[PDB]
Amino acid sequence: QPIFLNVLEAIEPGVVCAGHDNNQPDSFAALLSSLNELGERQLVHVVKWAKALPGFRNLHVDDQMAVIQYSWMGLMVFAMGWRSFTNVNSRMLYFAPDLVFNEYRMHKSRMYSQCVRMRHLSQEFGWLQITPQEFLCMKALLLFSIIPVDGLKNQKFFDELRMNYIKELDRIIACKRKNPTSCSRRFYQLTKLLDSVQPIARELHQFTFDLLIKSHMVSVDFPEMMAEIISVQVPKILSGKVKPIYFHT
Ligand SMILES: N[C@@H](Cc1cc(I)c(Oc2ccc(O)c(I)c2)c(I)c1)C(=O)O
């Protein structure tokens, strides 16, 4: 495989447990608290993963933290969808080996509709027969799919880096598409899939935001990093100061 592909497959984070006590009844407080703890843990891996991405360190240090704090949601949801597809054939949401959501939990989580959309996204991997290489390249591009309206500290470098990752995706598609009427069609399908992630991410952004505000009333715990990011970064997205980068209108 090319060097780019070797790197993506090599830095891909391993299994991460949520530390949820399945010995406890499925309550809203317990379920969401574990989801937050999982988010905190995953965030650590995302940071290491990102800094290990080709050219990422070329971005200004401040922009490195910015893009991560804005796209972590989309990145995790996309990865979760892939796990769910690969582990339980998208039958359930495989957040973590110790935190698998079934119908009952989807309802109990008080975000059934959102879970439904994530399951659909999960199924898309199967319907479109997404390859492991395509998944990796798409997930990397998600790290560069949401920035502030006023641009980053160094938009030049970000725009160049994003472009290079979009090109890498093309090669992965053109490195097997022997059919002349499937190559271009494939890029269309993948870009559409990538876009369908943002709408889902925004719904979770609004949901987690509201949950944090009334977290003390519903007995839901938010880790240090999660609480800080959801109250400082997320609001910028919900207020329209930070918007996702769509391929299609
Ligand atoms: N295509 C290559 C890997 C390859 C991947 C990427 I993302 C590239 O983007 C940049 C641009 C400016 C930089 O400072 C850095 I660091 C990286 C380049 I240049 C090459 C391979 O497969 O070996």
Ligand SMILES: C[C@]12CCC(=O)C[C@@H]1CC[C@@H]1[C@@H]2CC[C@]2(C)[C@@H](O)CC[C@@H]12
């Ligand atoms: C990103 C996580 C945790 C990591 C993952 O696999 C995807 C999943 C999507 C729902 C998120 C959850 C983290 C905690 C959140 C943000 C809850 O507060 C509400 C929505 C939850």
